[PDB]
Design a protein around this nucleic acid. Structure first.
Ligand SMILES: [Mg+2]
Ligand SMILES: [Mg+2]
Ligand SMILES: [Mg+2]
Ligand SMILES: [Mg+2]
Ligand SMILES: [Mg+2]
Ligand SMILES: [Mg+2]
Ligand SMILES: [Mg+2]
Ligand SMILES: [Mg+2]
Ligand SMILES: [Mg+2]
Ligand SMILES: [Mg+2]
Ligand SMILES: [Mg+2]
Ligand SMILES: [Mg+2]
Ligand SMILES: [Mg+2]
Ligand SMILES: [Mg+2]
Ligand SMILES: [Mg+2]
Ligand SMILES: [Mg+2]
Ligand SMILES: [Mg+2]
Ligand SMILES: [Mg+2]
Ligand SMILES: [Mg+2]
Ligand SMILES: [Mg+2]
Ligand SMILES: [Mg+2]
Ligand SMILES: [Mg+2]
Ligand SMILES: [Mg+2]
Ligand SMILES: [Mg+2]
Ligand SMILES: [Mg+2]
Ligand SMILES: [Mg+2]
Ligand SMILES: [Mg+2]
Ligand SMILES: [Mg+2]
Ligand SMILES: [Mg+2]
Ligand SMILES: [Mg+2]
Ligand SMILES: [Mg+2]
Ligand SMILES: [Mg+2]
Ligand SMILES: [Mg+2]
Ligand SMILES: [Mg+2]
Ligand SMILES: [Zn+2]
Lengths: 134, 86, 135, 52, 122, 158, 50
RNA sequence: CGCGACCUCAGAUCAGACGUGGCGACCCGCUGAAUUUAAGCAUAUUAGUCAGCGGAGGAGAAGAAACUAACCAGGAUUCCCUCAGUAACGGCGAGUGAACAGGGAAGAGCCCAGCGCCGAAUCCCCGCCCCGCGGCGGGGCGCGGGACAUGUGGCGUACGGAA
RNA sequence: CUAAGGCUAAAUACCGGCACGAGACCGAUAGUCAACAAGUACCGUAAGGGAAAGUUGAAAAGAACUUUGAAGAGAGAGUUCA
RNA sequence: AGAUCUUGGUGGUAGUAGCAAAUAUUCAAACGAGAACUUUGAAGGCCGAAGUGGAGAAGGGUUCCAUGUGAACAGCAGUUGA
RNA sequence: CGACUCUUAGCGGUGGAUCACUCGGCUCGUGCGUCGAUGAAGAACGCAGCUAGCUGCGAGAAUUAAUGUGAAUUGCAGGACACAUUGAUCAUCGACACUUCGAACGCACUUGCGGCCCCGGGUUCCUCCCGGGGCUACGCCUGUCUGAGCGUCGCU
């Protein structure tokens, strides 16, 4: 279990840190697992969610294998919006239903130099860990 | 009449706003603030009212300079340096 | 001596505290002169003082002051100690020779009042109830 | 805060309690009565080699 | 078409002041548009122009201050804003040279009787 | 009010004691801090004994305790003088000195100087320059025979 | 009164400016917990500090 | 009947520095009650405590014996245990009340004045040059100013010291 | 033992501050006065006194539309697991 | 279950006391869902220049002015309002 | 028959107890232990497109720069942002800036009024008016300059 005396296991402290986190670590908190194919291609497990990557929902009312592209990462409400994940309201307009990024799986990554750089960084750290623990 | 009738005669302010401490306790006729004692160089403060002390102690306001001092202390009060340019 | 500063000599209380005259200040007049010199010259440090004359109504003392920021003082060891921040207004804390005499400091059986550095230190030590973890 | 939270026990009594606890750990009925599911343990004073 | 702090530093003082004046004029016109109805885009452009003015002003001030620092480098007396501002107490304390210098008696002691490295057999 | 038989008790709780009560909840923390400081000091003086300088043999003053013997503050200057050790060099080689202690009797004097001679025999002196051994000791007896001493140096034993 | 000092007029100006209702879009914000301006002052209900 | 030297003073928006005020849990110096207890109450107690004033620092204060002792003697200060609710104080009533030795935590010692000796050996400031900047120092120079014999510096301080 | 001169770290103290960790504690009349725009609203000329006030839902999906009423307010309909 | 207990909530009283100091209102019309109370007109009165008039000081601080609303307040009402 | 009253129950009101929760306290412990004339603490006034409070900030005003990060902020709107001819946001914070009172510092304040030196303009150097910049507190130390004394003297 936790042995470091400088990290807290207090429930109130953890919840206060989570619900008052700045957006630059709300990005880290709002991470999503990669698909098995992506986990095989890139030697990483998770990835912070991003504006224009395509995910599918694995829990809740919108479970399915349909692939929808993310359209908004609403870090203030800890949710993301997807293309066809939406509902009709009273006046007939459609509103996006916010679902947690931990309840989706990323099936295609929106790639630029920063995402790629983070990808080799995570993969190299995991490889170093595997070689150490071999 | 010591009651209602005499309350109609009050039209002359004893106290005004104090330029120090911003409190409506500056006796106009004595030229002395009843809360801070403004013309005195030292702040009026007494130990028989801890509530009065904590109403106006350090940290109850802005601390424009003390915040920076607290932040600057954690890096040894370094000056004349900048982070390595990218 | 030190007359009690009460209006019309009325000290309201038990008769043991009715004294107004024949009362004495706990600090010597030399300490008072040192304190006045230090208070007027707040940027200087009182070192010592000595007796130069007295009258029926006045005592005269000459107080040695040191400017702690002169380079002659500041560049000289065995004198840099007075430049430390802890050594400011010594005469107001009773750390000069004239101020120290009224504190009852010393070694041996005559000075049991101030074991620990001061009267208050000894009083706190002797009046604190040490409640250990295991009684 | 000065509730006397701590108690001091005689050292001989603490050693006595340790001895009684050890002696009761070698009796299958008592360890069973603590609910420890010893039904296929080969020997209750269970001793393994130093390789562990 | 924002302005950045990096590409302002190469410019000299005259065109920096010219650009600051143009930004001030544009901000005044944007405020005029704000009080006369205007459009939402011009209302949003107020903050952009204000931050651009702040950028130009801080570049000018930093260049002036560093030029003054280069001018007063190596001089005995410097303006108070160019001196370090560690802490009043830290500024009153002794400098390293007069902190670490010793009397002749003390260094004679350290020369004659230095502390030795030793061990004791059990 | 007294009640039947009992002891006349005089509690000293008439003086607002609750404002000055010293609790000991930081006692384990204080012990941890003290041990950490001890280990840091022992690491600082690496080959030097952890407990510190050697102390003299000293008889307890009064008639209650004069049969016992304990450790004193430092070696008297006469003990150092007849032991052949300078009073300013002794502190550099870990000998505690006490200029204000006198030697009333010759027996304590001789005991303390045998103590000093034994310590000087057991001392290993490292040269100031490791590559230049001037007069301290041979390199062989300080290669592996040097080791930090735990506990008081030559403990005083009745 | 009609005669007044500059500081008094400025104080009254600020007390005028901060005596207004909340904007309507405040209640649309995430985690509002604000229903109305609870520091509203009326010139006849309560009197100012000066 | 003017010009100089010194002494004692004064002015300056003179050159360069410094102090003020805040916090104030802990610390240092003063000032300092009464409620209360005594089954009343005045000494006493509360208590050198509350209130009041001043001054600091990350700690402060104390501190290297004009000490404890009476022993076969210990050996700066500070803190803990114990001495000890004891010696003692007290309308000897209510109540108050240490210290030495002992065991530990820590452990560190020193500097002047004075008596002297050494061609004031001493110190500050202003100009110039070089090395540096990063807390403003190092070296060299000035028939450059000042302090200083009404005493600066080196040796040296009771454990003795010097020649 | 050597007063009427001076310095000195450690062990020690810490209900203020900066930043942390924990608890056989309290659980919105409790625990700080203050879990919330709290030393705030408000009271007193002033010194100063000083509150009350937590919870829709998983997600606003916060009741489109029809209908009586001048409206508040209703009757249907609708969202929701409710 | 008590403490003329603390804080909060709720009854009977009870649709009760009461909305009675300073002479006084009436007719028509307009707006308006709605008029004893608003507005206009007509009439009858009152303050009667030491005023129920016209303007200031102190004090208040936006109460001033126009437009809009009819939730709450103006101890009945309101289409009116500080 | 009804009304009224009482008892009990169903349902509906009033009220917010109980229960569950908890970004809050209280207590203990640890490491640091740092303010200010280079203008502190405190106060006032301002600053957002829509903003009253809280918060943040100071006329560069809900922030500039720099560094790290790496695509958002979000209640609405707007507009950026090839993320490489460099980057939204957030964090850090060492550069810059930091209104008025306040030890508060030209004098004074429930108001206002000066003086000195430079610069620009109206003037067309001369000092009147306007604007801008820098100074102008008390105490005290070392040094400097200017002095005072029927203080002590020397020469004349
Ligand atoms: Mg009366
Ligand atoms: Mg009056
Ligand atoms: Mg008495
Ligand atoms: Mg010397
Ligand atoms: Mg009124
Ligand atoms: Mg000057
Ligand atoms: Mg002070
Ligand atoms: Mg009594
Ligand atoms: Mg009684
Ligand atoms: Mg009585
Ligand atoms: Mg006090
Ligand atoms: Mg000290
Ligand atoms: Mg001392
Ligand atoms: Mg001595
Ligand atoms: Mg006993
Ligand atoms: Mg007593
Ligand atoms: Mg020890
Ligand atoms: Mg000499
Ligand atoms: Mg509460
Ligand atoms: Mg509840
Ligand atoms: Mg209604
Ligand atoms: Mg339900
Ligand atoms: Mg009850
Ligand atoms: Mg009636
Ligand atoms: Mg009636
Ligand atoms: Mg008539
Ligand atoms: Mg009439
Ligand atoms: Mg009139
Ligand atoms: Mg009106
Ligand atoms: Mg009504
Ligand atoms: Mg019910
Ligand atoms: Mg930036
Ligand atoms: Mg006036
Ligand atoms: Mg003369
Ligand atoms: Zn005031």
């Amino acid at each position: 279990m936790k042995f470091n005396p400088f990290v807290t296991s207090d429930r109130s402290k953890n919840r206060k840190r989570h619900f008052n986190a700045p957006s630059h670590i709300r990005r880290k908190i709002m991470s999503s697992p990669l698909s098995k194919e992506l986990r095989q291609k890139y030697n990483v497990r998770s990835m912070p969610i991003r504006k224009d990557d395509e995910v599918q929902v694995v829990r809740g009312h919108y479970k399915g294998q349909q692939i929808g592209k993310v359209v908004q990462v609403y870090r203030k409400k800890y949710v993301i919006y997807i293309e066809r994940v939406q509902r009709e309201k009273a006046n007939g307009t459609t509103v996006h239903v916010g679902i947690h990024p931990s309840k989706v799986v990323i099936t295609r990554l929106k790639l630029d130099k920063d995402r790629k750089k983070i990808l080799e960084r995570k993969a190299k750290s995991r490889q170093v860990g595997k070689e150490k623990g071999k | 009449t010591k009651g209602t009738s005499s309350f109609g005669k009050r039209r002359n302010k004893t106290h005004t706003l104090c330029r120090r401490c911003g409190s409506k306790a500056y006796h106009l006729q004595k030229s002395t603030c009843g809360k801070c004692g403004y013309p005195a160089k030292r702040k009026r403060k007494y130990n028989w009212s801890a509530k009065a002390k904590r109403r106006n102690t350090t940290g109850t306001g802005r601390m424009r300079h003390l915040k920076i001092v607290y932040r600057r202390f954690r890096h040894g009060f370094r000056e004349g340096t900048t982070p390595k340019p990218k | 001596g030190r007359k009690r500063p009460v209006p019309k000599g009325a000290t309201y209380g038990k008769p043991v505290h009715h004294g107004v005259n024949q009362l004495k200040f706990a600090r010597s007049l030399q300490s008072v002169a040192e304190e006045r010199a230090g208070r007027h010259c707040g940027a200087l440090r009182v070192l010592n003082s000595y007796w130069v004359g007295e009258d029926s109504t006045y005592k005269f003392f000459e107080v040695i002051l040191i400017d702690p920021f002169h380079k002659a003082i500041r560049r000289n060891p065995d004198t840099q100690w007075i430049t430390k921040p802890v050594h400011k207004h010594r005469e107001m804390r009773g750390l000069t020779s004239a101020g120290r005499k009224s504190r009852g400091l010393g070694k041996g059986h005559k000075f049991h009042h101030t074991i620990g550095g001061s009267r208050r230190a000894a009083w706190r030590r002797r009046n604190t109830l040490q409640l250990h973890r295991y009684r | 805060t000065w509730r006397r939270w701590h108690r001091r026990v005689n050292t001989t009594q603490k050693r006595y309690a340790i001895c009684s606890a050890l002696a009761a750990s070698a009796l299958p009925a008592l360890v069973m009565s603590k609910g420890h599911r010893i039904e296929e343990v080969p020997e209750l004073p269970l001793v393994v080699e130093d390789k562990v | 078409a924002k302005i950045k702090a990096r590409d302002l530093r190469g410019k000299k003082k005259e065109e920096l002041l010219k650009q600051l004046d143009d930004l001030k004029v544009e901000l005044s016109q944007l405020r005029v548009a704000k009080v006369t109805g205007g459009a939402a885009s011009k209302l949003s452009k107020i903050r952009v122009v204000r931050k651009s003015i702040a950028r130009v002003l801080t570049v000018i001030n930093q260049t002036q201050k560093e030029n003054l620092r280069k001018f007063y480098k190596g001089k005995k007396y410097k303006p108070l804003d160019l001196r370090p501002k560690k802490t009043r107490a830290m500024r009153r304390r002794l400098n390293k040279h007069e902190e670490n210098l010793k009397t002749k008696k003390q260094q004679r002691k350290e020369r004659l009787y230095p502390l030795r490295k030793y061990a004791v057999k059990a | 009010a007294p009640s039947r038989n009992g002891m006349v008790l005089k509690p000293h709780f008439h003086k607002d004691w609750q404002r000055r009560v010293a609790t000991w909840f930081n006692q384990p923390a204080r012990k941890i801090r003290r041990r950490k400081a001890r280990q840091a000091k022992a690491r600082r003086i690496a080959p030097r004994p952890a407990s510190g300088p050697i102390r003299p043999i000293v008889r307890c003053p009064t008639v209650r305790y004069h049969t016992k013997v304990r450790a004193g503050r430092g070696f008297s200057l006469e003990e150092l003088r007849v032991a052949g050790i300078h009073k300013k060099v002794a502190r550099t080689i870990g000998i505690s000195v006490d200029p204000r202690r006198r030697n009333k009797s010759t027996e304590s004097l001789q005991a303390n100087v045998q103590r000093l001679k034994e310590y000087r025999s057991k001392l290993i002196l490292f040269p100031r320059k490791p590559s230049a051994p001037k007069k301290g000791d041979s390199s062989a007896e300080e290669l592996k025979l040097a080791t930090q001493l735990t506990g008081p140096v030559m403990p005083v034993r009745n | 009164s009609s005669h007044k000092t500059f500081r008094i007029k400025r104080f009254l100006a600020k007390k005028q400016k901060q005596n207004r209702p909340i904007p309507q879009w405040i209640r649309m914000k995430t985690g509002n917990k604000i229903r109305y301006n609870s520091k509203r002052r009326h010139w006849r209900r309560t009197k100012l500090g000066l």
